[PDB]
Design an enzyme around this catalytic site. Structure first.
Site, mmCIF file in Angstrom:
data_model
loop_
_atom_site.group_PDB
_atom_site.id
_atom_site.type_symbol
_atom_site.label_atom_id
_atom_site.label_comp_id
_atom_site.label_asym_id
_atom_site.label_seq_id
_atom_site.Cartn_x
_atom_site.Cartn_y
_atom_site.Cartn_z
ATOM 1 N N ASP A 85 0.851 -1.200 0.000
ATOM 2 C CA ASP A 85 0.000 0.000 0.000
ATOM 3 C C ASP A 85 0.873 1.231 0.000
ATOM 4 O O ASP A 85 0.584 2.217 -0.714
ATOM 5 C CB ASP A 85 -0.824 -0.007 1.274
ATOM 6 C CG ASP A 85 -1.808 -1.135 1.275
ATOM 7 O OD1 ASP A 85 -1.895 -1.875 2.272
ATOM 8 O OD2 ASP A 85 -2.498 -1.359 0.236
ATOM 9 N N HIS B 161 11.462 12.174 -10.110
ATOM 10 C CA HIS B 161 11.517 10.787 -9.718
ATOM 11 C C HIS B 161 10.183 10.215 -10.045
ATOM 12 O O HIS B 161 9.708 9.270 -9.446
ATOM 13 C CB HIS B 161 11.913 10.672 -8.224
ATOM 14 C CG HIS B 161 11.041 11.480 -7.299
ATOM 15 N ND1 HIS B 161 11.277 12.807 -7.049
ATOM 16 C CD2 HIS B 161 9.914 11.165 -6.623
ATOM 17 C CE1 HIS B 161 10.345 13.289 -6.245
ATOM 18 N NE2 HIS B 161 9.501 12.314 -5.961
ATOM 19 N N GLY C 174 16.687 19.732 -4.576
ATOM 20 C CA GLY C 174 18.036 19.839 -4.068
ATOM 21 C C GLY C 174 18.072 19.949 -2.565
ATOM 22 O O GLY C 174 17.056 19.778 -1.873
ATOM 23 N N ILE D 134 12.113 21.555 0.333
ATOM 24 C CA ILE D 134 11.259 20.437 0.602
ATOM 25 C C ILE D 134 12.198 19.253 0.983
ATOM 26 O O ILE D 134 13.146 18.943 0.265
ATOM 27 C CB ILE D 134 10.420 20.104 -0.636
ATOM 28 C CG1 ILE D 134 9.329 21.207 -0.898
ATOM 29 C CG2 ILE D 134 9.610 18.722 -0.496
ATOM 30 C CD1 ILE D 134 8.708 21.002 -2.239
ATOM 31 N N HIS E 181 7.909 14.309 0.705
ATOM 32 C CA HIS E 181 6.474 14.600 0.559
ATOM 33 C C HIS E 181 5.752 13.255 0.510
ATOM 34 O O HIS E 181 6.424 12.192 0.402
ATOM 35 C CB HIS E 181 6.216 15.485 -0.691
ATOM 36 C CG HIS E 181 6.692 14.881 -1.970
ATOM 37 N ND1 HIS E 181 7.421 15.581 -2.905
ATOM 38 C CD2 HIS E 181 6.591 13.624 -2.442
ATOM 39 C CE1 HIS E 181 7.714 14.781 -3.918
ATOM 40 N NE2 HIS E 181 7.213 13.587 -3.661
ATOM 41 N N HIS F 65 7.888 9.878 -0.055
ATOM 42 C CA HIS F 65 9.125 10.128 -0.788
ATOM 43 C C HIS F 65 10.020 11.021 -0.023
ATOM 44 O O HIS F 65 9.580 12.060 0.527
ATOM 45 C CB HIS F 65 8.859 10.760 -2.212
ATOM 46 C CG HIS F 65 8.032 9.892 -3.081
ATOM 47 N ND1 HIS F 65 7.521 10.290 -4.298
ATOM 48 C CD2 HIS F 65 7.647 8.596 -2.926
ATOM 49 C CE1 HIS F 65 6.921 9.274 -4.888
ATOM 50 N NE2 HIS F 65 6.936 8.251 -4.047
ATOM 51 N N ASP G 222 13.666 13.184 -0.021
ATOM 52 C CA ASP G 222 14.693 13.784 -0.897
ATOM 53 C C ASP G 222 16.126 13.343 -0.525
ATOM 54 O O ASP G 222 16.632 13.667 0.541
ATOM 55 C CB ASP G 222 14.550 15.311 -0.793
ATOM 56 C CG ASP G 222 15.398 16.042 -1.808
ATOM 57 O OD1 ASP G 222 15.189 17.275 -2.017
ATOM 58 O OD2 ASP G 222 16.275 15.483 -2.520
ATOM 59 N N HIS H 202 5.903 12.467 10.184
ATOM 60 C CA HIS H 202 5.147 13.558 9.458
ATOM 61 C C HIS H 202 4.608 13.040 8.090
ATOM 62 O O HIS H 202 3.415 13.102 7.827
ATOM 63 C CB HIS H 202 6.059 14.778 9.299
ATOM 64 C CG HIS H 202 5.448 15.904 8.509
ATOM 65 N ND1 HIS H 202 4.856 17.000 9.114
ATOM 66 C CD2 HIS H 202 5.365 16.119 7.175
ATOM 67 C CE1 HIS H 202 4.401 17.818 8.187
ATOM 68 N NE2 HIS H 202 4.686 17.314 7.001
ATOM 69 N N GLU H 203 5.489 12.506 7.259
ATOM 70 C CA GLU H 203 5.109 11.974 5.986
ATOM 71 C C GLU H 203 4.011 10.896 6.124
ATOM 72 O O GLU H 203 3.012 10.894 5.403
ATOM 73 C CB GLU H 203 6.330 11.475 5.202
ATOM 74 C CG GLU H 203 7.376 12.555 4.939
ATOM 75 C CD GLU H 203 6.796 13.931 4.566
ATOM 76 O OE1 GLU H 203 5.900 14.008 3.782
ATOM 77 O OE2 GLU H 203 7.286 14.949 5.049
ATOM 78 N N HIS I 253 0.666 12.297 6.505
ATOM 79 C CA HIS I 253 0.030 12.560 5.198
ATOM 80 C C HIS I 253 -0.534 11.255 4.528
ATOM 81 O O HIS I 253 -1.628 11.235 3.916
ATOM 82 C CB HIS I 253 1.042 13.246 4.296
ATOM 83 C CG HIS I 253 1.396 14.670 4.686
ATOM 84 N ND1 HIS I 253 0.436 15.620 5.013
ATOM 85 C CD2 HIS I 253 2.591 15.322 4.703
ATOM 86 C CE1 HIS I 253 1.035 16.786 5.249
ATOM 87 N NE2 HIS I 253 2.336 16.638 5.048
ATOM 88 N N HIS J 182 -1.547 19.623 7.371
ATOM 89 C CA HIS J 182 -0.694 20.292 8.328
ATOM 90 C C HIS J 182 -1.428 20.875 9.485
ATOM 91 O O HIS J 182 -2.630 21.115 9.395
ATOM 92 C CB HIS J 182 0.130 21.417 7.663
ATOM 93 C CG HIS J 182 1.164 20.887 6.724
ATOM 94 N ND1 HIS J 182 1.458 21.470 5.532
ATOM 95 C CD2 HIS J 182 1.865 19.727 6.754
ATOM 96 C CE1 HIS J 182 2.363 20.751 4.889
ATOM 97 N NE2 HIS J 182 2.632 19.686 5.615
HETATM 98 CA CA LIG Z 1 15.192 19.291 -0.849
HETATM 99 CA CA LIG Z 2 0.502 3.298 -2.835
HETATM 100 ZN ZN LIG Z 3 7.685 12.176 -5.053
HETATM 101 ZN ZN LIG Z 4 3.809 18.009 5.279
#
Ligand SMILES: [Ca+2]
Ligand SMILES: [Ca+2]
Ligand SMILES: [Zn+2]
Ligand SMILES: [Zn+2]
Ligand SMILES: [Ca+2]
Length: 165
Positions: free
Chosen positions: A55, A65, A73, A77, A80, A93, A95, A115-116, A119, A125
């Site tokens: 999942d 990506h 970079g 961010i 996410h 994902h 970075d 945190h991720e 989401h 947030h």
């Molecule tokens: Ca970054």
């Molecule tokens: Ca999925």
């Molecule tokens: Zn992504």
């Molecule tokens: Zn967030």
């Protein structure tokens, strides 16, 4: 109204690839413990699979990506994730231009993943700087870390609280 939710309790995740910044086992541990934070307050249970479609896909990548959210970079961010749904839904994902760690230097993987995954389970947030869903990163030690009241209220309005006994 709020966004869609996973409509089952057993949810799988797969770690697509590992950052070389850390020990592989520590990535595993940080991600498992970040799911546990959310498992502790809902009826959801998370298990890692190594093959098969999961999942929640956990990915480390720099730049573009394959989704509509190319990374940017170092800094900016950090990571996410996508809310519940099929396919890219639920995916998280990170970075690779950040420096992922088990400690107070660089960016702490565990805290970032909590945190991720927030989401990934449907949360947005928070305006509370004590919430883990506050939008910007602030280090707190893994031992002292706790979900804020607001994080709990949010996740429980989506999934309930468990369930015991
Ligand atoms: Ca970054
Ligand atoms: Ca999925
Ligand atoms: Zn992504
Ligand atoms: Zn967030
Ligand atoms: Ca890196």
């Amino acid at each position: 109204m709020m966004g869609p939710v996973w409509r089952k309790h057993y949810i799988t995740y797969r770690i697509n690839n590992y950052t070389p910044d850390m020990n592989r086992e520590d990535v595993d541990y940080a991600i498992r413990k970040a799911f546990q934070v959310w498992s502790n307050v809902t009826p959801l249970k998370f298990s890692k699979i190594n093959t098969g479609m999961a999942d929640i896909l956990v990915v480390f990548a720099r730049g573009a990506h394959g989704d509509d959210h190319a990374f940017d970079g170092k800094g900016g961010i950090l990571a996410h994730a996508f809310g519940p749904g099929s396919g890219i839904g639920g995916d998280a994902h990170f970075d690779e231009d950040e420096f992922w760690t088990t400690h107070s230097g660089g960016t702490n993987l565990f805290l970032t993943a909590v945190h991720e995954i927030g989401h990934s389970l449907g949360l947005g947030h928070s305006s509370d700087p004590k919430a883990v869903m506050f939008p910007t990163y602030k280090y707190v030690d893994i031992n002292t870390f706790r979900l804020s009241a607001d994080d709990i209220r949010g996740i429980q309005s989506l999934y309930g609280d468990p369930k015991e006994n």
